[PDB]
Design a protein around this ligand. Structure first.
Ligand SMILES: Nc1nc2c(ncn2[C@@H]2O[C@H](COP(=O)(O)OP(=O)(O)OP(=O)(O)O)[C@@H](O)[C@H]2O)c(=O)[nH]1
Ligand SMILES: Nc1nc2c(ncn2[C@@H]2O[C@H](COP(=O)(O)OP(=O)(O)OP(=O)(O)O)[C@@H](O)[C@H]2O)c(=O)[nH]1
Ligand SMILES: Nc1nc2c(ncn2[C@@H]2O[C@H](COP(=O)(O)OP(=O)(O)OP(=O)(O)O)[C@@H](O)[C@H]2O)c(=O)[nH]1
Ligand SMILES: Cc1ccc(C(=O)NCc2cccnc2)cc1NS(=O)(=O)c1ccc(C2CC2)cc1
Ligand SMILES: Cc1ccc(C(=O)NCc2cccnc2)cc1NS(=O)(=O)c1ccc(C2CC2)cc1
Ligand SMILES: Nc1nc2c(ncn2[C@@H]2O[C@H](COP(=O)(O)OP(=O)(O)O)[C@@H](O)[C@H]2O)c(=O)[nH]1
Ligand SMILES: [Mg+2]
Ligand SMILES: [Mg+2]
Ligand SMILES: [Mg+2]
Ligand SMILES: [Mg+2]
Ligand SMILES: [Mg+2]
Ligand SMILES: [Mg+2]
Lengths: 429, 124, 423, 439, 428
């Protein structure tokens, strides 16, 4: 049951490259597209074929489409050293971007471009015997990742309501961001795609920046060092479908998402050790996922009640150790909501986690990623809602959106929805 | 450490289980109506601007027009004022010379009656 | 790739516009004939923004030169970089403007504004995706101020969806060309509020004051004044001209820097002011200093709505970032609270010629109302007595356009102060 | 393009035009035969000197000038002078009877005989110009031709050329070196009729020029050409930025906009520095400041009025020679501090500057010494209301007894024109007073 | 241009007129034959004003009712230089009868006078006007002269008419009726001339007798004075400079009111024809003696009135700065004698060429209110005769009525009244 990846905007595309780079080395696929360990040439139904289809010449082609209205970022993939893997069709570019403007990306230019990207998606979907759904990668603050992604998400539901839609979104961080209108863009895009996404893994850019600086001993990490750590967390999430727990995309919705609106699970990853020794306990890495210092989104999980959570191990892990590891942690009293059973869905993948050779993070015997739908993630929403309110109170910058045909009422139609989501979060909290 | 573990899917390079510690619409035409309503209000914004720029084009025409009127009104008033004083100066100068020569003619006529009077005196 | 069309208008506009082209051409390694002679592809990655690929292997600036007199544009053709500009891009008249905004904007400017646009349209068809226009001009004269705003209005009519930016030299009694400068500036400030997306306020008073006081020169040359502007314009435009982590264009900066349409007047700043490379802590300190502002306004008299800073040279960006939030945290009260993270910076490791390190300040401060207040006081002083007003009435203008422009400028001062006391 | 036509009326205007065009020819190196061995463009080309000169097919460089006098003796010497071949004979127009110091004869009886003939030669020179800037009208105030005909010409020009710019260079009446008792009559009458028709009128009087030559050249009595050749430097300094390529120009419209704050207030007085005798010529040269300071000293005003008695409304400083803007700006800067020099409160900027780098030249063998630097200041100050009051008082002394009015009435004028003219001069005196009070 | 037609009528008119042609022709180096023999070239630049180049011939017209005078002026030196066609004579003189000259026998040949006037004016490039020399005491020069003046103004109304009129005095002629003929001429002159130079025989007698210390002056003595001032009055007319030799200009500047155009000429130094001239008067001596009553050609004291206008001409090689200083000195050392309501009413001229025999000379032409003394005296003698209506039948016999006499004396009495009104006129 194949799966299609979509990267919208600079953050979605760059992150997407970093993810496909790791997929190839995890499965040992070489930059020219060959896989020496793939013997059913030109076909088959293997586990890694959920994400790559095969040429007649044996080249392994990612089931992905790259969308940006500006071509500088896609031109990298167009010319990069992993350039052979994609067909020129898979890469779509306009030449004027959304100008950090949601309404420009959604109402203005997105009307001009979505038919094109939708056509390219069906050509990939028509190459799917069975297809569960889509993984869309986008930023919250950027005009393209905000405005166009939301337009594409609703069209994807009326066109393929059959399938499932999963989000990998970048939460705007005051330290690492590019636009002051990013609170505007974020609140607007979540309101319009909330009804059209089954699960959404959000990534607080400040947290990783903090993670790499402390745990890698790095001066100020590049975006590439951020992007490579993201790739480890994305890969572990998607690893379940790449080696056929969590082997269906509806298993993401069922295991971690009890209601529809609450579909923002917190992701945690451990371990992270500099490439600059012998590995640590299975209980050590498991204990780290409950420390807030390893969280992907800066929030206090002690202030929240878990509703569900998911633990995906990769490496030399056997059940008896985690059962032992998850016996001792119950010596932090982690409360759960009373209509959901206290417990952990656990998945194991025996092949050690891979790394980009030469990258800062070291190769490790065992790694774990915890995916928890805690209500503590609501405070990340609250900070975003406040900065939105500060500028919208004085109606700052909104003339740029109204100038694109957007009604001013959409700002509060989206804002009150955010108030409902934050209120609904503590209703079960 | 009692934990109801349930041994679920398991195979060659993967297995999974769930440990338990405690028990417990889509419309495209409505979409494109929003897109079109945004495009139409953009066109309303463009039309109201273009109308605003037309009044400024017309204001530039009016300013240039009155500049032509001021230059034209300046010419003809100068023309008529110069013609009026030149003609009035001619009548004044002609009246002065005509008066001066009529008195001179009166003086001539008086010389003829002086000569006439003497001749009638000579008949004595 | 997202080209920019440059237009220089009037005496000042053509002469600081000519030095801007000589300065950035030196940065991009382009010589007088227009052929490349620099050492790095970085000078060519975004060269199409400001230049056109010529027929041979040369680069021609996408620049239009406009004046109602052929004097100063002939002198820039006589300059070292005179031969680089396209010959058909020289659009001149013979009548002149007589330092009269009315002649530039109405009677004389109309006789030439059609031919200028014909050149604008030509180069517009020569661009894969034109992002907008930049104009250099003064506000005190007749052509640059009067005909410049008329040109900007007719450009907005043809390309309404494009970005318009001006570098506007504000008149000052310390360096003046004519006595009716309060009229010409007030009349076109009215216009820049409506028809440009942002305006960089170059104050001849600040230029002179900086040029005199902190640079110790008995009396400054015009090249000295223009040198500050060209270095300032060079720094304002580096991210458009050089590649980096961001693909900076005109609209994004406008979207991020202008919270309300009218408040698009920017206070430029530069550091260091040169007539021993500087440490990153010292640049960020002097760059925020009142003595480095190319507009004669004290930033401590207002609050920054939004601020963009551009650093150039080999340096560590964590130094830059820590310093930039240091002064943000040290002077918490001089930035507005209802715009979070309103100070963003960018770093380009290519410095300007003659300096290992430098920094450029682009500020949207409400302290700039002091600039429009200074012009408004000089305007009323003349307008109260209706002095020199007959040279504007004689061209078809009415008195109410003067009062409409005056109260509009005071309206701009009022609402700048409105958000100065905003919480 | 940007051509300028010079019209010289009367003996004063013609002999001042002799001095100027002789000086123009020496500044541009134009030989007395009309040929310029420094203009490569034969029979054409649009270099900067061509604003005042036209070129023939043979190379002769002819002035864009018209010399007109109701009487031929003064113009006859132009036709027989060393520069006779400069003009086509049609440019020098003369009648046979002068106005006999009578404005009425110049404006009405005698002037009407040659007025159209004059106007049609103006049109033919204007026909040879692709972009006419305006006219420079040279005349005195006191003579019948200089007052009566000039006024008639200015009225005609307004009809034929609309509001096109007309600038005057006028010699103000001075008893000390006067020539006619009726000078106050002619001057008041010509000022009254050319008021609406002239955009700006540069003014000197022969008294102040006479005294300056006496004081600074050590001449026991300066002759008329002494006065004229000094005046030629003032005029050339006014026209320098239009005949020479210059960094900072002042065209005809720039003079108007910057020196005339109100339609009736268009009488700036001239000033000039330095004026140095040729025998004590080459001592150490004077500063750029010193010659600027000299322009504001009351002893150096070419119209004998006291600037300390009034406020400055506009100052045009035109430099030529070895001077650059930074020198001028500094010299102006400290003048702006001088408490004795006062400006009206409705002109905050107050200054207009043009600069030319070509050095000033003088006629060889003259009394004036050649200098590296020179400046001419054209000041519009309320202080010249004194000059109007002096002229208007002399007018009053004779009009009260109607003395000499019969000469004007005999030529068709009415006494009503006299009172209209004087009443308007009383309004001009009041206007100069009214624009001087604070706001 | 600027040609002047000269006319001389009667005995006195032809006598001082012939003497005036004698003086300036030698000044212009023209011998009695009539051919140029002058040293300098300044002599012929303005020669056309008075001379017609045929050999140069005076633009002069010699008229008299008495035919004997024609043969007298020819018989005198420079007699043959006058054109013969220009002589116009009658059968016999008017016998001191003004009516005969103006109305009866004078009117017979006035048509022949205007013929040659027309003939001489037709040959003029641009005619300035006419000057007439004549006495007012006789009948031809006074009676017919004034008739000639008004006839000429009929044909040339816009041209200048100037006269050199010799007023009668009992000290040189005992003829009784001359006060009649002068009053009737003045009556004509005040309305029909632009300026008349009042040469008083009474003053001419006093100068030769009291100052020149002359026993019994001969008309030749008196005429030497007139010819000297007549040349001095016309110097700038006959010689070039920065000054325009014009008639209208002088008249416009010297005549503030149309009726007050009677000038008091003065000359310095006064000298006999054969005097040795041991020294040349210097500029302060000329200027002070020029304004002296002893040097006036009209029997009037200038300090009994005020100057309306004054024009002075200096002759010889001198410093113009000295002329200005002395001329300004006497202006404010005697400021009370110049009306204050005509500013700058005194202007002077200087010519480099001096008269014959005199290296330094000065000529004075003043429009003074003191000339009312001259008209008062003539009116005094007129009313004495007219009170008793003495000898009126000589005039009424020719056709005149008595009220012409009343109008003439009233109008002359208005003239003296008008001078006195401006004499005591105040600036305010
Ligand atoms: N983690 C990570 N975040 C990124 C990266 N690139 C951009 N971002 C974030 O994305 C946000 C802005 O959205 P972008 O993706 O850059 O802009 P866009 O999607 O291209 O939309 P446009 O405005 O039309 O250009 C900022 O908050 C950045 O922090 C990246 O490579 N890695
Ligand atoms: N500076 C100067 N002033 C002169 C000159 N010539 C005459 N004047 C003055 O001009 C005034 C007299 O006017 P003119 O030009 O001589 O007279 P005009 O124009 O010829 O008029 P008419 O002769 O009456 O027909 C007096 O103030 C004279 O002092 C001259 O050459 N130079
Ligand atoms: N000074 C001067 N006066 C003269 C001379 N001849 C005559 N007079 C005066 O002229 C007056 C007489 O008039 P005349 O000129 O002799 O007479 P006329 O003009 O010839 O007219 P009639 O003889 O009557 O036909 C007398 O009072 C004389 O004093 C002269 O030669 N010199
Ligand atoms: C950070 C920055 C600094 C400089 C430039 C730059 O030099 N652009 C080239 C150019 C364009 C137009 C005119 N002149 C020059 C671009 C950016 N990046 S930004 O996203 O546009 C942006 C985001 C947020 C803000 C502030 C509200 C906090 C400002 C700018
Ligand atoms: C200065 C002068 C002296 C002599 C003559 C001269 O001899 N002219 C030739 C002539 C003409 C007619 C009769 N006789 C001779 C002309 C002038 N110059 S002036 O303009 O006429 C003039 C202007 C003002 C005044 C004022 C004092 C009242 C007087 C004169
Ligand atoms: N900084 C600078 N300012 C100038 C320059 N030239 C003129 N100005 C100023 O520009 C204004 C006059 O405008 P100007 O350009 O000369 O007039 P225009 O030709 O009609 O556009 C005044 O405020 C002058 O101070 C220059 O070269 N540099
Ligand atoms: Mg982007
Ligand atoms: Mg296979
Ligand atoms: Mg003249
Ligand atoms: Mg040439
Ligand atoms: Mg200029
Ligand atoms: Mg006789």
């Amino acid at each position: 049951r194949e799966c299609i990846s979509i990267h919208v905007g600079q953050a979605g595309v760059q992150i997407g490259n970093a993810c496909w780079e790791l997929y190839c080395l995890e499965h040992g696929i070489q930059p020219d597209g060959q896989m020496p360990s793939d013997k059913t040439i030109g076909g088959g139904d293997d586990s890694f074929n959920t994400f790559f289809s095969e040429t007649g010449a044996g080249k392994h082609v990612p089931r992905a489409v790259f969308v940006d209205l500006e071509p500088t970022v896609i031109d990298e993939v167009r010319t990069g050293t992993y350039r052979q893997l994609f067909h020129p069709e898979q890469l779509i570019t306009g030449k004027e971007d959304a100008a950090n403007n949601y309404a420009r990306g959604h109402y203005t230019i997105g009307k001009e471009i979505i038919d094109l990207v939708l056509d390219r998606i069906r050509k990939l979907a028509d190459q799917c015997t069975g297809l569960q759904g889509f993984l869309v990668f986008h930023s919250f603050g950027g005009g393209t990742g905000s405005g166009f992604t939301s337009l594409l998400m609703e069209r994807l539901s009326v066109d393929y309501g059959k399938k499932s839609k999963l989000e990998f979104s970048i939460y705007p961080a005051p330290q690492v961001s590019t636009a002051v209108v990013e609170p505007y863009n974020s609140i607007l895009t979540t309101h319009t795609t909330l009804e059209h996404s089954d699960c959404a893994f959000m990534v607080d850019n400040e947290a990783i920046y903090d993670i790499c600086r402390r745990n890698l001993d790095i001066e100020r990490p590049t975006y590439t060092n951020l992007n490579r750590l993201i790739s480890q967390i994305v890969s572990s999430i998607t690893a379940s479908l790449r080696f056929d727990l969590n082997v269906d995309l509806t298993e993401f919705q069922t295991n971690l998402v009890p209601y529809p609106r609450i579909h923002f699970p917190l992701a945690t990853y451990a371990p992270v050790i500099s490439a600059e020794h012998e590995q640590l306990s299975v209980a050590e890495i498991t204990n780290a996922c409950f420390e807030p210092a390893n969280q992907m989104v800066k929030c206090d999980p002690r202030h929240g009640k878990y509703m569900a959570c998911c633990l995906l191990y990769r490496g030399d892990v056997v059940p008896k150790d985690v059962n032992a590891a998850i016996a001792t942690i119950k010596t932090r009293s982690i409360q759960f909501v009373d209509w959901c059973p206290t417990g952990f869905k656990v998945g194991i993948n025996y092949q050690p986690p891979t790394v980009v050779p030469g990258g800062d993070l070291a190769k490790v015997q065992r790694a774990v990623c915890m995916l928890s739908n805690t209500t503590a993630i609501a405070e990340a929403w609250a900070r975003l809602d406040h900065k939105f309110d500060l500028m919208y109170a004085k109606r700052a910058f909104v003339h740029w959106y109204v100038g694109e045909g957007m009604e001013e009422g959409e700002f509060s139609e989206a804002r009150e929805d955010m108030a409902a989501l934050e209120k609904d979060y503590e209703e079960v909290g | 450490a009692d934990m109801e573990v349930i041994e679920l899917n398991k195979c060659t390079s993967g297995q999974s289980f769930e440990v338990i510690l405690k028990p417990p619409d889509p419309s495209l035409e409505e979409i494109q109506k929003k897109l079109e309503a945004a495009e139409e209000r953009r066109k309303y914004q463009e039309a109201e601007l273009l109308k605003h720029l037309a009044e400024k084009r017309e204001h530039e025409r009016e300013v240039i027009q009155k500049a032509i009127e001021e230059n034209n009104n300046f010419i003809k008033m100068a023309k008529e004022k110069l013609a009026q004083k030149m003609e009035s100066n001619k009548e004044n100068r002609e009246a002065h010379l005509a008066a001066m020569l009529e008195r001179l003619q009166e003086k001539d006529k008086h010389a003829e009656e002086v000569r006439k009077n003497k001749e009638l005196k000579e008949e004595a | 790739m997202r080209e920019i069309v440059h237009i220089q208008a009037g005496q000042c506009g053509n002469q600081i516009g000519a030095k801007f082209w000589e300065v950035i051409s030196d940065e991009h390694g382009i010589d007088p004939t227009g052929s490349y002679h620099g050492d790095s592809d970085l000078q060519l990655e975004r060269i199409n923004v400001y230049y056109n690929e010529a027929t041979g292997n040369k680069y021609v600036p996408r620049a239009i030169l406009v004046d109602l007199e052929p004097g100063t544009m002939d002198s820039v053709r006589s300059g070292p970089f005179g031969q680089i500009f396209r010959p058909d891009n020289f659009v001149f008249g013979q009548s002149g403007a007589g330092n009269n905004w009315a002649k530039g904007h109405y009677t004389e400017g109309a006789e030439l504004v059609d031919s200028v646009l014909d050149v604008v349209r030509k180069e517009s068809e020569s661009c894969d995706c034109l992002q907008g226009f930049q104009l250099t001009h003064s506000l005190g004269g007749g052509t640059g101020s009067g005909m410049g705003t008329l040109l900007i209005s007719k450009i907005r009519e043809e390309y309404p969806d494009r970005i318009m930016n001006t570098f506007s030299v504000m008149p000052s009694p310390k360096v003046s060309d004519t006595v009716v400068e309060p009229y010409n500036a007030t009349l076109s400030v009215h216009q820049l509020v409506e028809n440009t997306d942002e305006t960089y306020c170059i104050d001849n008073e600040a230029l002179y004051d900086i040029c005199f006081r902190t640079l110790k020169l008995t009396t400054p040359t015009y090249g000295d004044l223009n040198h500050l502007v060209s270095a300032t314009m060079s720094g304002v435009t580096t991210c458009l001209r050089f590649p980096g982590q961001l693909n900076a264009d005109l609209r994004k900066l406008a979207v991020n820097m202008v919270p309300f349409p009218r408040l698009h007047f920017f206070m430029p700043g530069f550091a260091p002011l040169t007539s021993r490379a500087l440490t990153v802590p010292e640049l960020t300190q002097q760059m925020f200093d009142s003595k480095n502002m190319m507009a004669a306004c004290d930033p401590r008299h207002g609050r920054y709505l939004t601020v963009a800073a551009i650093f150039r040279g080999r340096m560590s960006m964590k130094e830059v970032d820590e310093q930039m939030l240091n002064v943000q945290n040290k002077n918490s009260s001089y930035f507005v609270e209802w715009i979070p993270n309103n100070v963003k910076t960018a770093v380009c490791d290519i410095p300007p010629r003659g300096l290992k390190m430098s920094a450029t300040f682009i500020g949207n401060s409400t302290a700039i109302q002091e600039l429009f207040k200074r012009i408004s006081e000089q305007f009323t002083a003349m307008f109260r007595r209706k002095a020199f007003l007959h040279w504007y009435t004689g061209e078809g203008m009415d008195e109410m356009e003067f009062t409409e422009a005056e109260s509009n400028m005071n309206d701009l001062v009022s609402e700048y102060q409105q958000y100065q006391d905003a919480t």
